[PDB]
Design a protein around this ligand. Structure first.
Ligand SMILES: [Cl-]
Ligand SMILES: [Cl-]
Ligand SMILES: [Cl-]
Ligand SMILES: [Cl-]
Ligand SMILES: [K+]
Ligand SMILES: [K+]
Ligand SMILES: [K+]
Ligand SMILES: [K+]
Lengths: 223, 225, 223, 224, 224, 222
C-alpha cells in the first residue's frame, strides 16, 4: 500500500530502512516549531517529522498586510537529539550538527503500529503482526513556557529505541544556536506494578540508574 | 491487511468489535493527560486512547539532570467515564472505588479503513456509497477541564463519534490518587444547522435536561466495502 | 479505502484530483476555539470539510446537564477566498459572509496519498512510483486571537496549499461576525539552501510582489 | 496627603464611605477585563475598580495600521455582582436587564493609610494599635473564569476584604452585550488554618451552601 | 516621599510636573517577557523608568546555579517615540534603536497622585481639593508577541498617556533587534453615553482621523 | 507606611529601629489556582502571611459549592539557604525551607532604586538607606506561570541573591520541592553609561554571576 515507516536514529547517523523497504529520503528529526510562542508538533511516526534540510529557523510567517518575515523575530525550532555531551553553552552553526538526530522515511508493505505494556515486560506484537523494534514509551514533552507536545501511543513515534531523560534540543531561530535548558521535560508512560488497575500511585523520585525499570516498554509492529 | 479501529463502551463492560473486525485487546479509555500544565490527548479513534492498565497517574517526567519524578507534583489524567453516579458527598473518589467509573475499550483490526461522517442535523448521516455501517452516535469535538486545558477529536475519525451522549463524558484524576467530576469541565459537540441558517446570525439557546441532544449533531462510523 | 481532502480557496467546489472520485463537498474548516482553547482539523483530512457552515458550528455542555449554544464568546476559523475586505474593514455578517468561505471536496483515493516539500522554490518530485495530484506552497501552522491556533502535518495533503495567501483564513464568532485581524499569522516552510543548513539564518522582510521568493513549494502524490 | 479607599456594596445601592473618610465619586464595580484573550484586573481596593459608567464593553483596541476597533471581536469585561440570581432560563442577560446584577462602588478619600488584615481563622482580626476600623469581611484573594484567565487582590489591600461572602461574587459580560454566570467562574478565598496544623498535610473538604462562609478566613479593613 | 513618574513619548527628557522635584531621568520600560511570561511595570511608577536601556535588560538563572544572558528568545518592550520606522519594515538594531525609545522622569511629590477617567471625550475634573498635573488618554492594557502583555492601574497616572498613539510601544529581542509588529494591540477605555450604559454596545471600526473620537479622556491630579 | 522585610532564612527578620512590628509570618510569593498564578508584591504586607500551609486557600463555584485541598492547586514561597533536597520535603520537614517576614510600621514610604550596574545606586537626596541588595525582577515555575516584582517596591531588592529564591509546595500533597523548571530573573549590569547596543550573549557559571547582577538599595525618606 506504500505505508510510510519513519525511523529516528537518535544519532548523527542516518538510520537504515528495514530490508525490503526502499528509502524515500533521509533528514533531520523535527519535534516541533514554536511560532508566536505556540507549539506546532510533527508526529514522530509520520514522514512530516523527517525534514530533509535542517535550519534553526525552517519557517517564515506572514500577516494580512501582504508582509512576511523570515528569521526576523523570536521564534524557535525543536529537534530530537543525539548522545552528544550536554553542551558548555549554546552550540553555534556547524557545532550543532552532532546534536541533531537523523531520520529516514521508508516505503513499507503494510501499516506499522506501536503497543505499550505499562510494564517492565515488553508488550507482545498482536497476533499476525511482526516486530520491527522495541523501545520505550515516549508520551509528551514541554520546554519554553508550557509549550510542548506529545506522541500518539499507536504511532511508532511513541516508541523510541533509546530512552533519554532529555530526548530533544532547542534551537534559537534567528540566533543560529541550539542548547539544553533546565526546563526541558520528557514524559514517559510508567511501569505499573499492578496487573491491570492501579488505584493509588506511590509517589517517588528516581535517580539515574533505577530510571529504566520504571519506564514502560513498547514494540513497533507490522503485518 | 489490517487497519485498527478503537471502540469505547462508556461502561465497565468490554465493548464488542463491530461486525467485520476482530479483537486485538481490551483496555481503559484514556481521553488525555496534562503534564506540567500542558494537555496532551489521544484521539479516541486510535488505539492510543485504549490502555491495558489504568492509573490516576500513568506517566512520569524526567529532567535535564537525569532525575525523574513520579506522582510527586500536580499532574492529571482524564478518562472516558461510565454512568456511575458520584457519591452524594461530592468528595473525590479514590483507590479501587475508582474502577466503577472508568470506561472500557476494544482495539480491533479491520479489513479496510474506517471513517466518520457528521450530518450537523438530528438525522443520522448515511455512509458513503461503498462503505458499511459500524455504529452511530453523537458528534464529539473537544473538551476542557482543569486550567481550561483540553484536547479534541479529528472529525474524520471514529473518535469524534461517541455512541452515548453524556454532558460529562469523562472524569478527572490526579497523581494524588483522587478522581472526580468538576464543575468547570466542558464537553463540546457539533451543533445542528439548518441549510437556511448557515449564513445567518446563530440563535443563542440554553438547553436543559430532557432537551440536550435536541441540538447535537449525529454521526456514523463507516468501513470501506 | 483511502481518502484525500482538497480545498479550492474559492466559492467553487474543488475538483477531485486525478485518479480519485468525489464523496461529498463542504466548507473549509481550519479550527475552532471554545472556552479560549483552540482545536484544529488537519486540512488533508475529511475533518476539515463540513457539509454545513456556521460562524458557530458547535455548542458546549456541563455536568449540571445544561448545554449552551452561541451563548459565550467562542470562535470558528475557515479557509477563505480572494474576496476583499469591505472598505469599512468592519466585521462581516449574514449572507455577506458567504463570498469569503472556501469550499472543499472529500475524495476516495485508490492508494496512499502524501505530501512532499522541496524547501526551495522548485517543485519537489513525487517519489518514484507515485503520480501527482496537485502542487502548491508549504503551509505548516497559524495563529490568531490570543496567539492560539493549530497546524498541518508535513506529509499530509493539508500542508500543501494550492494558492499562496498571506491571509489564507478568516475568523468568525458566535455572535455571527467574521473578519480578518492584524494578528492572524500564517506560517510556511522557508526555502533553505543546503549550504546554509548549519549557518545562522539571514533575516528577511518581504513585501507584496516578492513574498513567494522565500516560500517552500510542495506536491501531493498518490501511489 | 490624598490616600484613597474604594468600597463595593455588592448591591445596586451606592455604598457609603466608611466613617472617617469622604466620598469623591460613585460608580460600578469593575473586577477585570479580557482583551485578545489576556486578562487584566483592577485591584478592588483601588479607584480603578470603580468606573463612573458601565458597559459590557468598556474598552476598544487599536493597531499600528491606525485602525481602532470597538466591540468588534470577542472580548470580555467582569464586574462584582449583586444577589440577583440567574433567570430561570439560565440564558445570557441583555440590555436593561443587566442593571440589577452590577455592584456599585464608592471611591473615598482617607486622612491616612488604609489596609486590610486577615486572621486566617473564623475570628475577626483586630486592627493594629493606632488603627481604627472601616469595615469587616471575608478574605477574597483571586478568581478565574473564561479560559481559566483571571486576576486577584493584594492581601493588604481593602479589595481583598469583601463585606459579603459570595460563592459567585462576579458576573461575566461580553462585547456583544450579554452577561451571565458560568460553571467555571471560580472565586478563591483564604482558608482558616489552625496554628498547630501549619506544617501538616491539609485535610481535604467539600462544602455545601450554608456551611460555606464559616470555613473562610475573616478580615478587617483599617485606617491609621 | 511620594514619587510621580512621567513619560515624554519622545527622545526628550520630560519635565517634572509642577509641585514636584526631579530625582532622575531614564527610558520608558512598559514590560518584559521572560520564558514566555510577560511582566509589566506600571507606567505611573518609577519601575517603568530605567536609568539604562538595553534590548535585554535582564537574565535568568536555573536550579543548577547557571545563568543565561540574551541566549534564548526573550523580549523587552518600551514606550516609543514618533520616529518613523524604516521603509523596509525590517528590524532596527544597535544605535539606530535610540531614536525610537521614549524617555521618562521620576519625581518627588509632596502628596499622593491619581488619575480619573471620564469615559467620554470630555476631560474629567479633578476631585475637590486636588490639583491638575496633566491630561491625556485612558490607556488600559496591551499585547504583543504571543498575545502576552500587561496593563495599567486605572487609578494610576500610568493609565493616562499624554499623547495617544495606536502603537505606543516597540518590541525588542535579546538578539538586539527591535521593531513594530502587526499583532501588537493597544487597549484604551472607550467613550460611553450615560443613556446607553445598559444597551448593547454599538460595534465601530475607526480609521485615521476618527481614532480619538471613541477614546476616553483622563486627568492626573495631586491632593495638594 | 508598612515596611516589609523577608529574611530569606527560617528566622524572623528584625524590624528597623523605631518601627513597631505589626506582625511576622511566612514569605508568600504566589498562589496557583486552576494553573493561573496570582502573586503578592514582596514589598507589600500581603506577601507576609501569618500562618503557613501548603494550601492556604480554597475555592468556590457558582453552584454554591466550595472545595478545600480537593484538586491540584499550589503555593510558592520565598525560600531559605537550606540545601536543595534530593526529594520533596513533607510536613514538619518543610519548616527549614520557608523564608520568614515582618511587617513594620514606618514613618515614611520606602522605595527601591536600581543601578543596572555593579555599583550600588545612591539613595535620593533626603533619603536614608535601609538595606542594599540585588535586582529581583520576575520568576516562572510550573508551566509558564509565575510573576514579578515592581522595581520601585522594596520587594524587587533582595539582600541575598540566589538562582532559586523560592520553593514550590504542592497543595493537597502537603509537600514542597525544587523542580528543574524554576527560573529567577534579575536586572543585568550594563557597562555603557545609559544606552547598550547589541547584547553579548553569555552563559555564567557560579562565579562569574555576581558581576552580572544589577544592584539596588531600599531607601526611606529622611
Ligand atoms: Cl525568528
Ligand atoms: Cl459563543
Ligand atoms: Cl468585542
Ligand atoms: Cl488542591
Ligand atoms: K537553563
Ligand atoms: K469545581
Ligand atoms: K508582524
Ligand atoms: K524536576
Amino acid at each position: 500500500i506504500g505505508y510510510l515507516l519513519v525511523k529516528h536514529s537518535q544519532t548523527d547517523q542516518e538510520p537504515m530502512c528495514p530490508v525490503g523497504m526502499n528509502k524515500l529520503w533521509s533528514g533531520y528529526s523535527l519535534l516541533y516549531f514554536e511560532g508566536q510562542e505556540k507549539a506546532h508538533n510533527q508526529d514522530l511516526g509520520l514522514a512530516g517529522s523527517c525534514l530533509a534540510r535542517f535550519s534553526t529557523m525552517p519557517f517564515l510567517y506572514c500577516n494580512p498586510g501582504d508582509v512576511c518575515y523570515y528569521a526576523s523575530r523570536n521564534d524557535k525550532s525543536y529537534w530530537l537529539s543525539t548522545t552528544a555531551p550536554l553542551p558548555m553553552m549554546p552550540v553555534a552553526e556547524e557545532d550543532i550538527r552532532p546534536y541533531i538526530s537523523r531520520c529516514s522515511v521508508c516505503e513499507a508493505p503494510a501499516v506499522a503500529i506501536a503497543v505499550h505494556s505499562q510494564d517492565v515486560s515488553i508488550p507482545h506484537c498482536p497476533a499476525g503482526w511482526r516486530s520491527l523494534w522495541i523501545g520505550y514509551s515516549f508520551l509528551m514533552h514541554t520546554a519554553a513556557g508550557d509549550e510542548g507536545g506529545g506522541q500518539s501511543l499507536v504511532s511508532p513515534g511513541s516508541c523510541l529505541e533509546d530512552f533519554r531523560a532529555t530526548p530533544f534540543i532547542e534551537c534559537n531561530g534567528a540566533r543560529g544556536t541550539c542548547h539544553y535548558y533546565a526546563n526541558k521535560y520528557s514524559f514517559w508512560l510508567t511501569t505499573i506494578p499492578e496487573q491491570s488497575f492501579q488505584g493509588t500511585p506511590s509517589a517517588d523520585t528516581l535517580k539515574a540508574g533505577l530510571i529504566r525499570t520504571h519506564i514502560s516498554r513498547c514494540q513497533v509492529c507490522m503485518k | 491487511h489490517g487497519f485498527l479501529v478503537t471502540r469505547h463502551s462508556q461502561t465497565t463492560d468490554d465493548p464488542q468489535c463491530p461486525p467485520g473486525t476482530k479483537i486485538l485487546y481490551h483496555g481503559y479509555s484514556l481521553l488525555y493527560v496534562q503534564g506540567n500544565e500542558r494537555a496532551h490527548g489521544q484521539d479516541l479513534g486510535t488505539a492510543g486512547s485504549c490502555l491495558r492498565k489504568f492509573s490516576t497517574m500513568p506517566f512520569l517526567f524526567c529532567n535535564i539532570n537525569n532525575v525523574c519524578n513520579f506522582a510527586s507534583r500536580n499532574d492529571y489524567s482524564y478518562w472516558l467515564s461510565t454512568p456511575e453516579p458520584m457519591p452524594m458527598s461530592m468528595a473525590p473518589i479514590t483507590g479501587e472505588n475508582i474502577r466503577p467509573f472508568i470506561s472500557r475499550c476494544a482495539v480491533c483490526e479491520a479489513p479496510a479503513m474506517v471513517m466518520a461522517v457528521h450530518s450537523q442535523t438530528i438525522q443520522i448521516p448515511q455512509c458513503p456509497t461503498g462503505w458499511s455501517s459500524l455504529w452511530i452516535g453523537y458528534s464529539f469535538v473537544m473538551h476542557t477541564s482543569a486550567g481550561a486545558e483540553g484536547s479534541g477529536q479529528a472529525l474524520a475519525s471514529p473518535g469524534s463519534c461517541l455512541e452515548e451522549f453524556r454532558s460529562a463524558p469523562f472524569i478527572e484524576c490526579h497523581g494524588r490518587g483522587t478522581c472526580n467530576y468538576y464543575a468547570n469541565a466542558y464537553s463540546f459537540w457539533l451543533a445542528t444547522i439548518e441549510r437556511s441558517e448557515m449564513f445567518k446570525k446563530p440563535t443563542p439557546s440554553t438547553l436543559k435536561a430532557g432537551e440536550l441532544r435536541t441540538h447535537v449533531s449525529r454521526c456514523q462510523v463507516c468501513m470501506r466495502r
